[PDB]
Amino acid sequence: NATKVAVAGASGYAGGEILRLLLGHPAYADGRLRIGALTAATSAGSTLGEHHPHLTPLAHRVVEPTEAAVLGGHDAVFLALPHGHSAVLAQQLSPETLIIDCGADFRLTDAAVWERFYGSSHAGSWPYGLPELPGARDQLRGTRRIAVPGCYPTAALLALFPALAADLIEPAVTVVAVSGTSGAGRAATTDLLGAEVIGSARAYNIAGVHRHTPEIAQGLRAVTDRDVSVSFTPVLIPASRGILATCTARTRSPLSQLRAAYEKAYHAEPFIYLMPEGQLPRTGAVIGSNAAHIAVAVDEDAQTFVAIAAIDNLVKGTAGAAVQSMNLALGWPETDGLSVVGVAP
Amino acid sequence: VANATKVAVAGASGYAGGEILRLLLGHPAYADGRLRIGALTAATSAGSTLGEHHPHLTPLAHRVVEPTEAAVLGGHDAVFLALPHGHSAVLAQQLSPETLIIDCGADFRLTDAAVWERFYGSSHAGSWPYGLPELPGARDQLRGTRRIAVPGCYPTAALLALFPALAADLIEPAVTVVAVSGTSGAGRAATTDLLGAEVIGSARAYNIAGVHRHTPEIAQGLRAVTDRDVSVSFTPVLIPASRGILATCTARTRSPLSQLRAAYEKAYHAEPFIYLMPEGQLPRTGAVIGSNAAHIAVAVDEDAQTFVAIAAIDNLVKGTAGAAVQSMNLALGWPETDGLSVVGVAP
């Protein structure tokens, strides 16, 4: 009253998307939320329009250096750096400031797993910003700390958790997830160039080396008592946004039981849409929305459960999750600023 | 060995037909006068010119499309039935039986009548030599054949990715394949779901959980290399590209990576179209577009006790028309690589 919000990493894709959502948030329109300092590690002194020409209402804002002093004096701070490490910065801010970290530093609950995959000391763990996971909403209500999930784990966990929690599939899961290129971030490399990406698909970081692998495992372990294993293969495709996760696991359960488990899990979840029978998700349908579209099936011959989930990697996969969780932290309606209606075609 | 081979293409106006024609135009036997391009036919559009369907094929743009009828297809030494999604048993029966008949469709691919009837809803017609020369035993069946059943595009990628590991008994026979495909694999019949505005910027799985008809075709090729009971979980995913398949293929394993790599070396070291990626490299469909190559890498996820094989092909070349031409070369006693480059057109 009013809630003054800073965004660190404002010039990146996640930062831009948080800002897009905040501009459309009812708390912004009625004055209860103010957009304050917009910061970046380089390009201080540049204007936001130079980075985000779609954000014309903020085009004139001058980007400031990312430092604790600049971020101080805000009620909420988004650390909009999904690929960055914000433990050092986060430690300099008050426990009473709401910090929403888009990065990985506070996602994991096992220090040994952290050290193995990230090669640094474990900073700790904050409430995980996936409100639909069992128990997660309770953790987020009134929190002043949020660790936003990775984009791929968001899709895979939404696809898989209801089946595993109901003990209807085996705990060895396979996930092959296609993703648009914005999930790779805004740092220019030759491999992310348009000419390279357009008209091509490639798997990367395969066979368990992708850092989101243990993150999927952690979310699944939380809903079962069994040893979880995850085979996760990400595939870059020629789209700017979207993740379509194809998730499989062996099953002994009939389709009717699995379908019922998903209906029960998601029937009162405003962002999670279970496809009518005979329809399947498409990433095009969710772009620009905070929705996840989910369908499930059983391959009887292969004794295999198949779950498909589509999300916008930048919305439900990143910035939408961040805002959704922010709403919960602040006691605002969870759906504020977050449409379920995709911008298609 | 063939010396004058006049070729017809039935279904010339579709993607497979256009690609066969592209390859024939670039074939050394075309340039030296041994391979001659005859009748080009389609079910509708007779009287139109080829350029109205395939503006890339300018040397043939003026050719007039003829009706797909046995009488028109007569007097050709080879006939490509270039309908990957069609059923050509009826037409094939009408051709002079000495003709080299190369069917891009499914009617002669499968070897189990009950499986055929289950997935295709008709009586099994039988089987012809499968046009995937790199599969164990396949090349021998193609030499001098007058009949070729061209493989489906997805089975091509999945079988190349998986067969060496399974043949060596180094992975479990329950396999998972999630394959991304450009939209040309769905064919050229105009539907809303295949419209540019729909496909651009979107990805979707389709025909999931064992309903896709390429599922039993993958199973069949795998059953040929093992005595174990094979199962296949196959999910195809359409992505916003015109061409390419990237198949991600997995199965449980407890075998060292080095033994798996040795199986791929054994299978592919003398196969000119199959490229095993250098260490630290992975396939990309961009690298094989417009080539007859498959690029393959393998890995082991130790924590998940899972083998991962990635295969990239151009769905229209190694997945369709290149397979057809490769098999044609074998049928006619011509060098297998004739007209078929391993070099992709990238970016």
Closest CA to A9 of A87, A65, A76, A90: A65
Residue type, B111: T
Contact A1, A330 (CB under 8 A): no
Our CA-based measurement puts residue A214 at a distance from the nearest CA of chain B, in whole angstroms, of 10
Q: How is residue B334 annotated by DSSP?
A: -
Q: Where do breaks (C to N over 2.5 Å) occur in chain B, by preceding residue number?
A: none
The number of residues in chain A equals 345
Catalytic residues of B: 153
Q: How is residue A225 annotated by DSSP?
A: S
Q: Contact B306/A174, CB-based, under 8 Å?
A: yes
Alpha-carbon distance B258 to B271, whole Å? 20
Residue A119 CB-density burial (10 A; 0-12 exposed, 13-18 middle, 19+ buried): exposed
Nearest CA in chain A to B298: A207
Q: Which residues pair with A174 in a beta bridge?
A: A231, A248
Contact B110, B216 (CB under 8 A): yes
Residues of A in contact with B198 (CB under 8 A): 284, 345
Data resolution in angstroms: 1.6
Contact B46, B66 (CB under 8 A): yes
A176, A218, A253, best to mutate vs chain B, most B CBs in 10 Å: A176
Relative orientation angle of helices A213-221 and A151-165, to the nearest 10 degrees? 30
Supply A247's token pair.
Answer: 């998730």
Closest partner residue to A208 (CB to CB) among B215, B244, B304 is: B304
Q: Contact B244/A306, CB-based, under 8 Å?
A: no
Quick check: is A151 catalytic? yes
Sign of the torsion formed by the C-alpha atoms of B129, B133, B139 and B145: positive
> In this structure, what is the dihedral angle of CA atoms B103, B109, B113, B119, given to the nearest 10 degrees?
-90
Does an H or E element contain A307, and which?
A: strand A304-311
Alpha-carbon distance A43 to A191, whole Å? 23
Our CA-based measurement puts residue B160 at a distance from the nearest CA of chain A, in whole angstroms, of 17
Say if B1-150+316-334 and B151-315 have the same CATH topology: no
Is domain A149-313 in CATH 3.30.360.10, yes or no?
yes
Our CA-based measurement puts residue B191 at a distance from the nearest CA of chain A, in whole angstroms, of 15
Residues of A in contact with B305 (CB under 8 A): 229
CATH code that applies to domain B1-150+316-334: 3.40.50.720
Spell out the CATH class of B151-315.
alpha beta
CATH topology for A1-148+314-332 is: Rossmann fold (3.40.50)
Residues of B in contact with A342 (CB under 8 A): none
Residues of B in contact with A345 (CB under 8 A): 197-198, 200-202
Q: Would you list the domain boundaries of chain A?
A: 1-148+314-332, 149-313
Supply B250's token pair.
Answer: 């997995």
Phi, psi of A307 (to 5 degrees): -125, 130
Cα–Cα distances in Å, from A94 out to A21, A169, A322? 25, 43, 19
Contact A278, B211 (CB under 8 A): no
